[PDB]
Design an enzyme around this catalytic site. Structure first.
Site, PDB file in Angstrom:
ATOM      1  N   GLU A  92       0.852  -1.158   0.000  1.00 38.19           N
ATOM      2  CA  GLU A  92       0.000   0.000   0.000  1.00 38.19           C
ATOM      3  C   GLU A  92       0.904   1.229   0.000  1.00 38.19           C
ATOM      4  O   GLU A  92       1.919   1.298   0.707  1.00 38.19           O
ATOM      5  CB  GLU A  92      -0.900   0.017   1.243  1.00 38.19           C
ATOM      6  CG  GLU A  92      -2.046   1.018   1.180  1.00 38.19           C
ATOM      7  CD  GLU A  92      -2.804   1.137   2.482  1.00 38.19           C
ATOM      8  OE1 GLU A  92      -3.366   0.096   2.947  1.00 38.19           O
ATOM      9  OE2 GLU A  92      -2.823   2.264   3.019  1.00 38.19           O
ATOM     10  N   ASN A 111      12.155   1.463  -3.497  1.00 36.98           N
ATOM     11  CA  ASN A 111      11.716   0.071  -3.179  1.00 36.98           C
ATOM     12  C   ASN A 111      12.483  -0.966  -4.002  1.00 36.98           C
ATOM     13  O   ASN A 111      12.988  -1.955  -3.471  1.00 36.98           O
ATOM     14  CB  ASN A 111      10.220  -0.116  -3.407  1.00 36.98           C
ATOM     15  CG  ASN A 111       9.444   0.273  -2.177  1.00 36.98           C
ATOM     16  OD1 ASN A 111       9.094  -0.571  -1.358  1.00 36.98           O
ATOM     17  ND2 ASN A 111       9.179   1.564  -2.050  1.00 36.98           N
TER      18      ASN A 111
END
Ligand SMILES: *[C@@H]1O[C@H](CO)[C@@H](O[C@@H]2O[C@H](CO)[C@@H](O)[C@H](O)[C@H]2NC(C)=O)[C@H](O)[C@H]1NC(C)=O
Ligand SMILES: *[C@@H]1O[C@H](CO)[C@@H](O[C@@H]2O[C@H](CO)[C@@H](O)[C@H](O)[C@H]2NC(C)=O)[C@H](O)[C@H]1NC(C)=O
Ligand SMILES: CN(C[C@@H](N)c1ccccc1)S(=O)(=O)c1cc(F)cc(F)c1
Ligand SMILES: *[C@@H]1O[C@H](CO)[C@@H](O)[C@H](O)[C@H]1NC(C)=O
Ligand SMILES: [K+]
Ligand SMILES: [K+]
EC number: 3.2.1.45
Length: 497
Positions: free
Chosen positions: A340, A370
Site C-alpha cells: 500500500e 523500493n
C-alpha cells in the site's frame, strides 16, 4: 494510439482528461528491432508516456555521465504492480457511465493502458468504505455459519475484478487484507479504537478469526476468484493505539508471531487454499527490522510466512537502508513487498491535487527506492477517488492516480498514474532487477531490470530542474546516447543479443 487531452487545475502540471468517448491509450505493445531502443517520456511540461526510438550505437566517446548495465549482477524477481479495489474505488468507478468505466479499467489493466497485474482486496470494510460491516456481524457465531459476502463484494468489487481480469493479457494476482474482525471477537467490542482479539493465540477466538480467512477465500472462490496472497492484518500497530479512528485490529509483533504459528498458518495450510501465500507486517517500515526479528526467529511462525508486506505513506520521511536494507540482510530469503502506498493524507494538504508533478515524482522515487532495496512489487492504494479524495466514512481523504468527476462523467489521470505506469507497463512479472553503475556523481534516480525473455528496461527519473545528458551502456549490445530532461521520467527498452 490516442494522446493525452491535457487540462490544468493550477498545479505544476496537467491531468489527462477521459470521458465516455475518449481516453488516451497506447497501440498494442511491440519491441523495436534489435539495434534500436524505445523511449517513453513524461514531463512536467506535459508529455505523457510519449514513444520515440533511437539507435543503439557501437561506440561512445566523452567524459559525460555513463550508466553501465550490470546484466549478470542479479537481484530480486518482480511480482508486479497494481492498486486497491476498495469500496470507495468500486463506488467511484461504477458511478461513471459504462463507457467511461471501461476506459478507466483499460487504463489500468489492458495492454492499451499500463498493464497492472495486482489487485488488493480489503476483507470487508475499511476507512475507504461508506458502511461499517464485517462478513460475520451476527454475534457468537464461532463456527461462522452466518459468514457471507454483502453487496459491496457481490455487486461492486467482484464484478469489477472480473472485468479487470477480462481486459488483462497478463495474469492478475489478488492480495487480501483485513482491517477489523467481527466486534464480538474483540476486547473493545468496536470496529475501531484500541482493541485486539480476545484471549490468546490457539483459542476459540483466534481459531475463529483464522477460519474467517478460509471462509473469505471459500466465498471468493465460489465467485471464481483465487488469491495469490493474504496479509496477516492491515496495519496491526494501529489497533494498539487509543482512539484509533477507523477499522483496526491490534497485534504486537509477539501476538502476530503466535497467531501465525498457532492459528492462521496451520488453518491456511489445512485448507484447499494452502497455496495462498501469507505476508506479515502489512504496515509502515519503521517497524522493521524489529517485527521481522520477532516473527521470523520463531521457526514455528517462520515456516508459514512467505513475505513481509510494507506500507509507504509518501507524505512522511523514514529511513530505507536501516529498515528494508537491514531486513533483507537479516532475512534474505523472505521477500519484501510494498502492499500500500499513498499521498495527500496530511490534513493540511489538499487531498487531491489535480496535476501535481511533485506527487507523481513521489510515486516514482518511492518505486525506485523500493526496487533498489530488494522489494518485489508495489501496490497503490485506492484505484479511483472523487475530487474530495473520498468517499471515506471518517473523512480520511487522500489522493489517487485516477480522480472521477461524476457530474461531467469524466475522470482525470494524474501525474501519479504515468509515474506508476513507467514501471507497471514495462516490467512483466518474473522480471529481475539487475545492477546499474553510474560513472560519476549525478542527480538522477534510476533502476535497471531484465525481462523474462532477456530484454532490458531502464527507468530514469530526474527530480532536478536541469537537463542531464547521459549515456547508457549495455556491455553486450552497445550505447544509448540520450538526455534526461529536468522534471522528466523516461523508460528505455531494448532487445539484447
Ligand atoms: C469527451 O472528451 C472529448 C475530448 O475533449 C470531447 O471531444 C472534443 O469536443 C470538442 C468540442 O466539440 C472538440 O473541439 C474536440 O475536437 C473533440 N475532440 C475529440 C478528440 O473528439 C467529447 O465531446 C467529450 N465527450 C462527451 C460525451 O462529453
Ligand atoms: C482441515 O480440513 C478439513 C476440510 O476437508 C476439515 O474437515 C471438515 O470439518 C468440518 C468440521 O465441522 C466438517 O463439518 C466437514 O464436513 C469436514 N470436511 C470434509 C470434507 O470432510 C477439518 O476440520 C480441518 N481442520 C481444521 C480446520 O482444524
Ligand atoms: C544513488 N542514486 C541517486 C543519486 N544519483 C542522487 C539522485 C538525486 C539526488 C542526489 C543523488 S540511485 O542509485 O539512482 C538511487 C538510490 C536509492 F537508494 C534511491 C533512489 F531513489 C535512487
Ligand atoms: C567505431 O569505432 C571503431 C574504432 O575506432 C571504428 O573503426 C569505427 O569506424 C567507429 N565508428 C562506427 C560508426 O562504428
Ligand atoms: K453475514
Ligand atoms: K489531506
Amino acid at each position: 494510439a490516442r494522446p493525452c487531452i491535457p487540462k490544468s487545475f493550477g498545479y505544476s502540471s496537467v491531468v489527462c482528461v477521459c470521458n465516455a468517448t475518449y481516453c488516451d491509450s497506447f497501440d498494442p505493445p511491440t519491441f523495436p528491432a534489435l539495434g534500436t531502443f524505445s523511449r517513453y517520456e513524461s514531463t512536467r511540461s506535459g508529455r505523457r508516456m510519449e514513444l520515440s526510438m533511437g539507435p543503439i550505437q557501437a561506440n561512445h566517446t566523452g567524459t559525460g555521465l555513463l550508466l553501465t548495465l550490470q546484466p549478470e549482477q542479479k537481484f530480486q524477481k518482480v511480482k508486479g504492480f497494481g492498486g486497491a479495489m476498495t469500496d470507495a474505488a468500486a463506488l467511484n468507478i461504477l458511478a461513471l457511465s459504462p463507457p467511461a468505466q471501461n476506459l478507466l479499467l483499460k487504463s489500468y489493466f489492458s495492454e492499451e493502458g499500463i498493464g497492472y497485474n495486482i489487485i488488493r482486496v480489503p476483507m470487508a470494510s475499511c476507512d475507504f468504505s461508506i458502511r461499517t460491516y464485517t462478513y460475520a456481524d451476527t454475534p457468537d457465531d464461532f463456527q461462522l455459519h452466518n459468514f457471507s459476502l454483502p453487496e459491496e463484494d457481490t455487486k461492486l468489487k467482484i464484478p469489477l475484478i472480473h472485468r479487470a481480469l477480462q481486459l488483462a493479457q497478463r495474469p492478475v494476482s489478488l492480495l487480501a487484507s483485513p482491517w477489523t474482525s467481527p466486534t464480538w471477537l474483540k476486547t473493545n467490542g468496536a470496529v475501531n479504537g484500541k482493541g485486539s482479539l480476545k484471549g490468546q493465540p490457539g483459542d476459540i477466538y483466534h481459531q475463529t478469526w483464522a477460519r474467517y480467512f478460509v471462509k473469505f477465500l471459500d466465498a471468493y472462490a465460489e465467485h471464481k476468484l483465487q488469491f495469490w496472497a493474504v496479509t496477516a492484518e492491515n496495519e496491526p500497530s494501529a489497533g494498539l493505539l487509543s482512539g484509533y479512528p477507523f477499522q483496526c485490529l491490534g497485534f504486537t509483533p509477539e501476538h502476530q508471531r503466535d497467531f501465525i504459528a498457532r492459528d492462521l498458518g496451520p488453518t491456511l495450510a489445512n485448507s484447499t487454499h494452502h497455496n495462498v501465500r501469507l505476508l506479515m507486517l502489512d504496515d509502515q517500515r519503521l517497524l522493521l527490522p524489529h517485527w521481522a526479528k520477532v516473527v521470523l526467529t520463531d521457526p514455528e511462525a517462520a515456516k508459514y510466512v512467505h513475505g513481509i508486506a510494507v506500507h509507504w505513506y509518501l507524505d512522511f520521511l523514514a529511513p530505507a537502508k536501516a529498515t528494508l536494507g537491514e531486513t533483507h540482510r537479516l532475512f534474505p530469503n523472505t521477500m519484501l513487498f510494498a502492499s500500500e502506498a499513498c499521498v495527500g493524507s496530511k490534513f493540511w494538504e489538499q487531498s487531491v491535487r489535480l496535476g501535481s508533478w511533485d506527487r507523481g515524482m513521489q510515486y516514482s522515487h518511492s518505486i525506485i527506492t523500493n526496487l533498489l532495496y530488494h522489494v518485489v512489487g508495489w501496490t497503490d492504494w485506492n484505484l479511483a477517488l472523487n475530487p474530495e479524495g473520498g468517499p471515506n466514512w471518517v473523512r480520511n481523504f487522500v489522493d489517487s492516480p485516477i480522480i472521477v468527476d461524476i457530474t461531467k462523467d469524466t475522470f482525470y489521470k494524474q501525474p501519479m498514474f504515468y509515474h506508476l505506469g513507467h514501471f507497471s507497463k514495462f516490467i512483466p512479472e518474473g522480471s529481475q532487477r539487475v545492477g546499474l553503475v553510474a560513472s560519476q556523481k549525478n542527480d538522477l534516480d534510476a533502476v535497471a531490470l531484465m525481462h523474462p525473455d532477456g530484454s532490458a528496461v531502464v527507468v530514469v527519473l530526474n527530480r532536478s530542474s536541469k537537463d542531464v545528458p547521459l549515456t547508457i551502456k549495455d556491455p553486450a549490445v552497445g550505447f544509448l546516447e540520450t538526455i534526461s530532461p529536468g522534471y522528466s521520467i523516461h523508460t528505455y527498452l531494448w532487445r539484447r543479443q
